[PDB]
Amino acid sequence: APSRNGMVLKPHFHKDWQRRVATWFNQPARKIRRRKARQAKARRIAPRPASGPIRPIVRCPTVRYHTKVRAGRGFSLEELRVAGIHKKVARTIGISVDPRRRNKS
Amino acid sequence: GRKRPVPKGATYGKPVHHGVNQLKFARSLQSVAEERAGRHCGALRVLNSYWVGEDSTYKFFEVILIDPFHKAIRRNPDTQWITKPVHKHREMRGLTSAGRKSRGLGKGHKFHHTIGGSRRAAWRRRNTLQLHRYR
Amino acid sequence: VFIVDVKANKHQIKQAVKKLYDIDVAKVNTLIRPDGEKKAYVRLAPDYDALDVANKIGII
Amino acid sequence: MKFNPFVTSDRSKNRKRHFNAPSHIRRKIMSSPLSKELRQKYNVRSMPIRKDDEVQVVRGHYKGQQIGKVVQVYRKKYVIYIERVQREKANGTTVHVGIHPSKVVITRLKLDKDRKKILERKAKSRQVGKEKGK
Amino acid sequence: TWRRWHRRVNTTQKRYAICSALAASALPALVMSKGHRIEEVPELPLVVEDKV
Amino acid sequence: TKGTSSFGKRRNKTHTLCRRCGSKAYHLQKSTCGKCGYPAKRKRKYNWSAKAKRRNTTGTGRMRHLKIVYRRFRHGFREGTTPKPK
Amino acid sequence: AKIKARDLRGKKKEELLKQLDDLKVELSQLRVAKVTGGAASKLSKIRVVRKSIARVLTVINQTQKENLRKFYKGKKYKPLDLRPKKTRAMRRRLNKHEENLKTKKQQRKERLYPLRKYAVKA
Amino acid sequence: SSHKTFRIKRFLAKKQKQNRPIPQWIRMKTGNKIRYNSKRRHWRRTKLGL
RNA sequence: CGACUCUUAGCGGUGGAUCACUCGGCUCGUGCGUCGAUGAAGAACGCAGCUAGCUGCGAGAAUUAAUGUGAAUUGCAGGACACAUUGAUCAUCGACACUUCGAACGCACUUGCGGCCCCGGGUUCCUCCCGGGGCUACGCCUGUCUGAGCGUCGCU
RNA sequence: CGCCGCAGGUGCAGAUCUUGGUGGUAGUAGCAAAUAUUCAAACGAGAACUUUGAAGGCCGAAGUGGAGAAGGGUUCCAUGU
RNA sequence: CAUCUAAGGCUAAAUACCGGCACGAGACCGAUAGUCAACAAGUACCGUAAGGGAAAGUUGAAAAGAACUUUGAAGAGAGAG
RNA sequence: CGCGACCUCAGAUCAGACGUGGCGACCCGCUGAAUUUAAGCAUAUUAGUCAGCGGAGGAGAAGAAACUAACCAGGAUUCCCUCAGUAACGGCGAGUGAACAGGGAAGAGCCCAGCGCCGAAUCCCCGCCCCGCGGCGGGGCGCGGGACAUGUGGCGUACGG
Ligand SMILES: [Mg+2]
Ligand SMILES: [Mg+2]
Ligand SMILES: [Mg+2]
Ligand SMILES: [Mg+2]
Ligand SMILES: [Mg+2]
Ligand SMILES: [Mg+2]
Ligand SMILES: [Mg+2]
Ligand SMILES: [Mg+2]
Ligand SMILES: [Mg+2]
Ligand SMILES: [Mg+2]
Ligand SMILES: [Mg+2]
Ligand SMILES: [Mg+2]
Ligand SMILES: [Mg+2]
Ligand SMILES: [Mg+2]
Ligand SMILES: [Mg+2]
Ligand SMILES: [Mg+2]
Ligand SMILES: [Mg+2]
Ligand SMILES: [Mg+2]
Ligand SMILES: [Mg+2]
Ligand SMILES: [Mg+2]
Ligand SMILES: [Mg+2]
Ligand SMILES: [Mg+2]
Ligand SMILES: [Mg+2]
Ligand SMILES: [Mg+2]
Ligand SMILES: [Mg+2]
Ligand SMILES: [Mg+2]
Ligand SMILES: [Mg+2]
Ligand SMILES: [Mg+2]
Ligand SMILES: [Mg+2]
Ligand SMILES: [Mg+2]
Ligand SMILES: [Mg+2]
Ligand SMILES: [Mg+2]
Ligand SMILES: [Mg+2]
Ligand SMILES: [Mg+2]
Ligand SMILES: [Zn+2]
């Protein structure tokens, strides 16, 4: 029963949520494992960049973010063509390629 | 369709679950045929199947099976994947083309049920309460 | 009187006794004791003698 | 202190390992300090105990400079029995008193092929450690 | 196990506490109040050369 | 009479020892174990009885082969090789 | 006085079997002594004779098994017990040869476009 | 009954052997912690499984 | 004077609370993440000088071999063991071995009964008996051999 | 263990509360279905109950007799406490 | 107009893990607690069966575990150690 | 009225392999309630949850768009934060309820059929000899057999060839 003023609340705890609860006690261990794997991979590829291949300059899709620019999946086929790079050699030299992206501007 | 197997048509419960007839099995007859072929010939791996004919009461499917231990399969790449242990009895787990259709797997606004790998995967991920360490 | 293995039948008992002690036997009666061991009574040949065979075995 | 993440410091775990230790490391556990003269003759400090070496008890009821030869290494009870370290029971006869080997100092070592090799390894390791320290 | 053992403190408050502790260690009344036996220490903010 | 008097009639064993699983659940008149379901290939096992599942799960017995497999895993299932002779 | 597998191995099967038979006879007479009162020494020798029988049998079986392995060395078909006993799952795997061989298209891909070792200037 | 199977007889043989007291010298063992035989079975007191 | 009863104390019983101890849990985290027809999980039956349970093991039976270690094991007995003309014990465990059921596999079992092929003994090699050894389950793939069809043909 | 803070599986007379132990009742109810015992002796520390013998009685052959099935599983049989 | 090219197939990483093997730790519990199970515990025992399922830790540093005398048949005492 | 070829079938203790059963915490495919809430109760809810069945692996599933968007466009999958207790559903009651974009973790792409072209170039098995045994490989030889033109291998797959 409600008592005096207060928000009308709808808790979603009618469905035996106790059996499916995600506890995050292994969060710092997960962070350490991720860091160690990062260091191991960077050690494995010694002169190459540790982060990964160069990603393209890409504008954000919707009207909320189109003023902003982020990184894309890979350089387009047309970009590679006019840059003079074979699309099967770009990936080996460390360039991400996104075949399914077409240019409009 | 799949008639519900209850004695004398009695489903003791609320009238919403009183249906016996007009019920449909959630997997297609083609996937059923693939399941039966694989279950009988468990030593083989089901690849795919195709419709070959039907009458009023029966449907006929021809099913392609691969012997995972024949040397013509094991020494040939591009088919070595079917011999991997994780690829056994795929039809019982719905990995064939026919068995995959019933799962609702795909891309688009139409397929928001199977985000994460499967319906149960999505349901788990959505209905699990993520209790962080810091709240 | 011998305690023989539970799986040995009378023919095997007769052969084994005859070869082990180089003797001649008439018949074998077989009973399984309550505790599980098989006990075989072996009648010797009349020309042979259980007393001195037991002497040479060392059970006397 | 202790820094190895694979080495436990739990009291209960350590006690479990100690009391359930197999015999071949119960021998290592039952190790005794050498006398001053032995610690000078050999560049080693302690030595695991043996059947026929002569010790002297340094703690408890049976202290003294008397040199008694071991006659028993009762590893299950983690004790040893010594020649004249005994005690007379009620009926008239006598038994030995269990003594932890850590409460004695070895004065003479029952030398054979193996003991000399153990002494050699220990002295070599000590020399290596001190020469690294210098 | 879901008892919220961890607490998150504001970063500004944490730095505030560090500043207060650093300031407090420089008062001989407070450090002697902790019982740290600072009687013949030449100067309470004790600084030594980097040779140590 | 349903009480003590009727209890004097029970002298015919219904269940007996099952060759699999060693329990006195082998229904004689039905030729089927009540605990393992012996003529059936698969073991009779149910999730509603977790206590009964743990009474007979792997490791509640002897594990004669698994306790050697576990030991061999640490050295990688080596065969055909022997330690260096003295 | 004891019997050692160390020096039991230089002998032929025939005298090995004779030694085993003598040990069996000794054990049988020891069992007779056990059931007819006997003595402590005879009772304690039973374990020793049993281990001696086990050592002789072990040497016999090992000799036979290595001879059989020598016989089947290089043959296309071997007895199952002479085949490796790794794991049922591990024996069904694809061997090194067929897990390493690749398609001609894959080989052409690798020949033409290998992975280059590179770096980026700051 | 007199009419019994070989398997039933084998089972009863094991039970008969298993129903006997502990050896005297067991108490002298180091860390014995065993008082008597707890698994003693009397035929008229507790009936067998089979 | 006592008996009985009540209250309080001393002491002694019954009882096993409290307190201290902890080779046990519970919770979290990490690293691997490995069963089985080459017979699994599970079960049954057995194995110690004296041993019923727990543990260990499979007729080689509280264990064989090998390697490391290096004088014990131990409740009593007994007995090796120059510890180098090689070694108690324990550990590791890669060689060997691993009874009966059990997916369980010749048929069937709350019992028992076969069939084929070799070897040995009575036989005195021929086929009866006894003993030993190896096969004898279902489904399915590729190949092999034997085949069936007034199925479609060809020659005759 | 005191003092300053911190965190609780933190305070028991009840719940026909749970577990364990203990009283009065109380040396009380009771050891009353199917006729029955007695004499001497032996062993034995100890005899109303054992054993032997002598009596008197019962089951009275659809038995309180002799054997079996099912079930029990060593209860069978000696010897000792 | 925009977008993709269904009805064939493969693919590591980030991810999950209350069963298994081997480990480390704790502001947790301290024997009516903590797992049912600190101990011969899925044991004893119950039910035809599916299944149900306990109780149960502590001499002492060392057995040095009370020699020997004495009453009783012994239990059990009294001295002594 | 016999003998061959092919097709479709059958047998075999034929030569050589493979499957079965166990565990099932995590995962995949099904089947699937009611207690409970709604202060009653039938849709709803519990819940695609418990129970039931099947199939795996060290992870599994997914996965390289018949996508999202409507922008000055993004670009496989999976996971975390957020969107969001929102859009929406609902005896529009109780209650239920995502997705896109943004930031991160990780990042990897590809192969067939077909269309064609290349004297079937293709593959399996059996013998003989040599080098290796370690997960049985290579080389050579066989007028040795078989599969296969009802289609094996090479180029080649929407990023055009
Ligand atoms: Mg309010
Ligand atoms: Mg990154
Ligand atoms: Mg008979
Ligand atoms: Mg190709
Ligand atoms: Mg008795
Ligand atoms: Mg008192
Ligand atoms: Mg050995
Ligand atoms: Mg019958
Ligand atoms: Mg015709
Ligand atoms: Mg409380
Ligand atoms: Mg109270
Ligand atoms: Mg209280
Ligand atoms: Mg109150
Ligand atoms: Mg009365
Ligand atoms: Mg009366
Ligand atoms: Mg009369
Ligand atoms: Mg009368
Ligand atoms: Mg009668
Ligand atoms: Mg009797
Ligand atoms: Mg207590
Ligand atoms: Mg408890
Ligand atoms: Mg008495
Ligand atoms: Mg065959
Ligand atoms: Mg309601
Ligand atoms: Mg209500
Ligand atoms: Mg109601
Ligand atoms: Mg409803
Ligand atoms: Mg379920
Ligand atoms: Mg399965
Ligand atoms: Mg996968
Ligand atoms: Mg896939
Ligand atoms: Mg819902
Ligand atoms: Mg083609
Ligand atoms: Mg595509
Ligand atoms: Zn069963």
Descriptive tags:
part of a larger assembly; 8 chains; A: 105 residues; alpha+beta; two-stranded antiparallel ribbon; 3 helices; C: 60 residues; 3-stranded antiparallel sheet; 3 strands; binds magnesium ion; binds zinc ion; RNA-binding; acetylation (chain G); structural constituent of ribosome (chain G); ubl conjugation (chain G); ribonucleoprotein (chain G); Ribosomal_uL29 (chain G)
Walkthrough of the structure:
It is classed as ribosome. The structure is cut from a larger assembly and holds eight protein chains of eight kinds. With 60 residues, chain C is of the alpha+beta class. Chain C is built from two helices and three strands; from the N terminus they run E-H-E-E-H. Chain C has helices at residues 10-21, 50-57; strands at 2-4, 25-32, 38-44. Helix content of chain E is 38%, strand content 0%. Helix content of chain G is 61%, strand content 0%. The chains are: A alpha+beta (105), B alpha+beta (135), C alpha+beta (60), D alpha+beta (134), E mainly alpha (52), F alpha+beta (86), G mainly alpha (122), H mainly alpha (50). Chains in contact: A-B, A-G, B-E, B-G, C-G, C-H, F-G, F-H. At the A-B interface, strand 1 of A face strand 3 of B. Strand 1 (21-23) of chain A pairs parallel with strand 3 (129-131) of chain B, so a sheet runs across the interface. One magnesium ion binds next to loops of chain A. Chain B binds four RNA strands through helix 1, helix 3 and helix 4.
Summarize the model shown.
With 135 residues, chain B is an alpha+beta fold.
What's the arrangement of secondary structure elements?
This is part of a larger assembly, with 8 protein chains of 8 kinds.
Chain B (H helix, E strand, L loop, with lengths): L28 H12 L4 E10 L4 E8 L4 H4 L22 H5 L17 H9 L1 E3 L4
Antiparallel strand pairs in B: 1-2
Chain C lengths: L1 E3 L5 H12 L3 E8 L5 E7 L5 H8 L3
Chain G lengths: L12 H23 L4 H33 L15 H4 L4 H5 L3 H9 L10
Helix pairs in contact in G: 1-2
Chain B binds 4 RNA strands through α1, α3 and α4.
Subcellular location (chain A): Cytoplasm
Family (chain A): Belongs to the eukaryotic ribosomal protein eL13 family.
Subunit structure (chain A): Component of the 60S large ribosomal subunit (LSU).
